[PDB]
Design a protein around this ligand. Structure first.
Ligand SMILES: Nc1ccn([C@@H]2O[C@H](CI)[C@@H](O)[C@H]2O)c(=O)n1
Ligand SMILES: Nc1ccn([C@@H]2O[C@H](CI)[C@@H](O)[C@H]2O)c(=O)n1
Ligand SMILES: Nc1ccn([C@@H]2O[C@H](CI)[C@@H](O)[C@H]2O)c(=O)n1
Ligand SMILES: [Cl-]
Ligand SMILES: [K+]
Ligand SMILES: [Zn+2]
Ligand SMILES: [Zn+2]
Ligand SMILES: [Zn+2]
Lengths: 153, 147, 154
């Protein structure tokens, strides 16, 4: 039927003094993202609004708007996607971070995302990459996330 | 039915004495893209050629005329365009007031209704060449179907 | 009707003294990609996109970083696991970003390798090449990046 695709990007700086929260999971580390600055949840939200052609995360959830962590935002995104007429079919994503090791936390992130989107676990995927010591990502100065989402009207 | 996906990437340097044109919209700014170097339309063009497996922009070829030709070639290969999504990564200037016009431009060029075309914008949080405003990146995804 | 999408990203450093192998093609060049396998950045990105579309995690889960491993053999194994999970591949698209060397003379060969490894006809596989317009570590030729997207159906 009426399938649509969306894609999402996000990046935040990595500094001492903030906790590291990615995909709703708090990961012990000497440093955290500046923004809860959940780079993975933001990229996924963008991908979803994109698939539904609803603009972007900033247009829905403004820095200034009096009307929240990134999971609340993800859930509101999904309701808006639903109300627009679209059912979510799957999400895939990649986190690019030189450190720390993310593999142990992947199932936790998938579980949070699946819960927030009301999806079966087998329709949510999260992957992790280093940047092979290249650029600001490779130097541990920031963390990037990429997302793809498929929906149907 | 026979769906296919494509993905596109483009980046251009920001330089003095060039108009800034993105998604076919002229945006007032001290610099512009070097190449009309419309990074957004180029990424979308590559995503569409990718979905139709027709190669890339460099193997085929202003950017709106090129986007129209791309759409022509896609249809010539037997595909219909179902939707486009995209992200512009620019530290500056503010793109928000220009986005709906970009969507309208793309929709017109692809012969698509507005609700099948999306454009999003992000800064780079002051990181890398994007963060320093040395260039602007675009990413695109397209879904087509062979009927 | 049960379609799924996946996306993939990879980057490797370019160093002297290594073969340059992208899309399974050995490309004449004074530097090659550094990695534990043959460091084929394009095949790895595609492999990740396919595992991602099937929700089977990532290339590191399946093939733990394989010393000098042929990344085409890895791609074929990935395709096998994707099929075993119940998915057929419908198409792959990809972009390589590199300052140098010129990739255009090798693109059709890369496409042919990928099609062979995924048992797809050529018309469902696409490879695009881009410079990074002189920007950043890619612009300085310090590494090569690949991006991929895949559509599958269960
Ligand atoms: N150069 C930019 C970057 C981002 N935005 C908008 O500002 C928000 C902040 I991420 C998003 O809604 C985005 O659309 C913008 O208007 N101009
Ligand atoms: N390293 C590169 C980068 C780009 N190109 C080709 O040159 C054109 C110019 I963007 C594109 O079509 C692309 O296929 C190439 O042959 N080698
Ligand atoms: N920050 C990171 C980066 C990567 N990995 C895992 O390590 C492998 C080496 I690229 C990746 O494919 C992924 O499986 C990880 O656990 N944490
Ligand atoms: Cl370059
Ligand atoms: K990038
Ligand atoms: Zn964010
Ligand atoms: Zn361009
Ligand atoms: Zn690799």
């Amino acid at each position: 039927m009426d399938f649509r695709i969306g894609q999402g990007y996000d990046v935040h700086q990595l500094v001492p003094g903030r906790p590291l929260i990615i995909g709703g999971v708090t990961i012990p580390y000497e440093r955290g993202l500046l923004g809860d600055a959940d780079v993975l949840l933001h990229a996924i939200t963008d991908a979803l609004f994109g698939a539904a052609a609803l603009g972007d995360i900033g247009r829905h959830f403004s820095d200034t708007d009096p009307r929240a962590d990134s999971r609340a935002l993800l859930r509101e995104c999904a309701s808006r996607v639903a109300q627009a007429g679209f059912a979510i079919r799957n999400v895939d994503s990649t986190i690019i971070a030189q450190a720390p090791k993310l593999a142990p936390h992947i199932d936790a992130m998938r579980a949070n995302i699946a819960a927030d989107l009301d999806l079966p676990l087998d329709r949510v995927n999260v992957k992790a990459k280093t940047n092979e010591k290249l650029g600001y990502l490779g130097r541990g100065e920031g963390i990037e996330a990429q997302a793809a989402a498929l929906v149907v009207r």
